């Protein structure tokens, strides 16, 4: 003799020892990224090609 | 004489010694992957090509 069993309810596991099907469908995906940058240029110049006489002292 | 046998119920195994057909259909597939990376560059420079006279001491 087994216990009371419902009629219209689905067959769910209810006690220790009942079986149940697992459908393994796992799909995980993670990601990350980053960056950084910096820059600097400089260029100076000056040239007195032909100096007049009254400025030759400087 | 064999025991009571139902009429409309399907032929399921009920006692020790009854036979039952298993349809082996197994298909499992798992996978995983990962990665990582890092990078760094640097480049500095400085050059005094033509130094004026009043700065020659530095």
The number of distinct β-strands of chain A equals: 0
Oligomeric assembly: part of a larger assembly
Q: In angstroms, what is the radius of gyration of chain A?
A: 44 Å
Structural class by SSE content of chain A: little secondary structure
Helicity range of the residues of chain A?
under 10%
Question: Would you give an account of this structure?
Answer:
This is part of a larger assembly, with 2 copies of chain A (58 residues). The termini of chain A are far apart. Chain A has 58 residues and is largely without helices or strands. Chain A has no helices and no strands. In chain A, 0% of the residues lie in helices and 0% in strands. The first copy, chain A, is rod-shaped, with a radius of gyration of 44 Å. The chains hardly touch. The PDB classes it as motor protein. Keywords: Flagella, LP ring, FlgH, FlgI, motor protein. The entry is titled "Cryo-EM structure of the flagellar LP ring from Salmonella". Chains A, B: Flagellar L-ring protein.
């Amino acid at each position: 003799n087994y216990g009371y069993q419902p009629l219209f309810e689905d067959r769910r596991p209810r006690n220790i020892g009942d079986t149940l099907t697992i459908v393994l469908q796992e799909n995980v995906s993670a990601s990350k990224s980053s960056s950084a940058n910096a820059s600097r240029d400089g260029k100076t110049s000056f040239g007195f090609d032909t100096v007049p006489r009254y400025l030759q002292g400087l």
